[PDB]
Amino acid sequence: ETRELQSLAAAVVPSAQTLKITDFSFSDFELSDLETALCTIRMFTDLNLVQNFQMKHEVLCRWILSVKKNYRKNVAYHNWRHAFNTAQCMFAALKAGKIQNKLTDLEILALLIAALSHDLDHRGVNNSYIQRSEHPLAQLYCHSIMEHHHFDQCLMILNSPGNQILSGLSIEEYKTTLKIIKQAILATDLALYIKRRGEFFELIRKNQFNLEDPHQKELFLAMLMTACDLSAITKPWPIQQRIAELVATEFFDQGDRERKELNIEPTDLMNREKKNKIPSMQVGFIDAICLQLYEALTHVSEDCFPLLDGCRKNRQKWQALAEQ
């Protein structure tokens, strides 16, 4: 195909150990785009997906480049690097967290594709903005608007000539995998996490959680998607500090759009005037959204404790910054 493909396809794919992708503390900051593509190949390979599903090397490389291409390079946070890191956290939870022992390769295939694809064509604004602005997508979908679009994009790329990494699946495996992918991408709508997490937390608290139950299995994969999606909140403080810059940039850029295009005053979360409140806001988000999730996940796998540990340490640093 293109020069990028040729370079990628011919490149040696270093080991997962070399690439550090099993570390919960992994950072992509020193990596070129090409190296993030090699990391992604390594993820598919070491989860046995390439071999078990008979993926051709050129097809996987083209698919990865198609996915990366369909994230926007002018969206500060929801871009290819966020999707790549989400997939890397999924790899680490599966390997270092040993969750791969409890899932089938078909489930893992869907999870990894969904992690990589779950914010495709994100435009730097949230569902509330899409609805309030009367964006065309808001006429197509009533809820989880962007996430429905992310899945549409995901399926378009999976079906593109030369990109069909699922061609080796039988029709029944293909249908099941697409449905898991769709659920997994829709799960990254924080609104759906908030609606469904109470059931997960109570099953865990009562020690009634049963991964053999298909409903609880689907619930767990949704919680795991959220855990990977939010995982910047667990990173070592140098990383977290930098990711926070991007989140704030994207939030405040939406606030500017709401002022200029919708003539409304943005909430504090998206109001650049309130930037000195980011520490207290990070603490609020950790308490409200993050801690119980990483706490619950460790009841599923004790080896996922580094995520919870990392979350607690960032809350300590953010609370110290809030106290000024």
Ligand X SMILES: COc1ccc(CNc2nc(N3CCC[C@H]3CO)ncc2C(=O)NCc2ncccn2)cc1Cl
Tell me: is residue 229 an annotated ligand-binding position: yes
Among positions 285, 295, 299, 309, the unique one binding ligand X when judged by CB under 6 A? 285
Whole-number Å distance between alpha carbons of 179 and 201: 24
Q: Is 78 a catalytic residue?
A: yes
Instruction: Specify burial of residue 142 (Cβ count, 10 A radius: 0-12, 13-18, 19+).
Output: exposed
Element (H, E) at 78: none
Element (H, E) at 23: none
Segments in 11-126 forming alpha helices (H): 16-19, 33-46, 49-52, 57-69, 80-95, 105-117
Number of amino acids touching ligand X (CB under 6 A): 16
Give the x-and-dash track for 226-265 against ligand X (CB under 6 A): ----x-xx---------xx--xx--x--------------
Among positions 188, 231, 234, 254, the unique one binding Mg ion when judged by CB under 5 A? 188
**Candidate segments 23-31, 153-161, 210-218, 281-289, binder of ligand X by CB under 6 A:** 281-289
Residue indicated by tokens 């996915």: 67
Residue partners of 205: CB distance under 8 A and separation at least 6: none
Tell me: is residue 82 an annotated ligand-binding position: yes
28 binding Zn ion? (CB under 5 A): no
**Candidate segments 101-109, 119-127, 132-140, 292-300, binder of Zn ion by CB under 5 A:** 119-127
Question: What CA–CA distances, in Å, run from 9 to 2, 30, 80, 216, 298?
Answer: 11, 21, 19, 39, 38
31 binding ligand X? (CB under 6 A): no
Among positions 28, 119, 250, 258, the unique one binding Mg ion when judged by CB under 5 A? 119
293 binding ligand X? (CB under 6 A): no
281 binding ligand X? (CB under 6 A): yes
Half-sphere exposure of 76 (CA within 13 A, CB side): 14
Contacting residues toward ligand X, per CB under 6 A: 190, 230, 232-233, 243-244, 247-248, 251, 269, 278, 281-282, 285, 288-289
Contacting residues toward Zn ion, per CB under 5 A: 119, 229
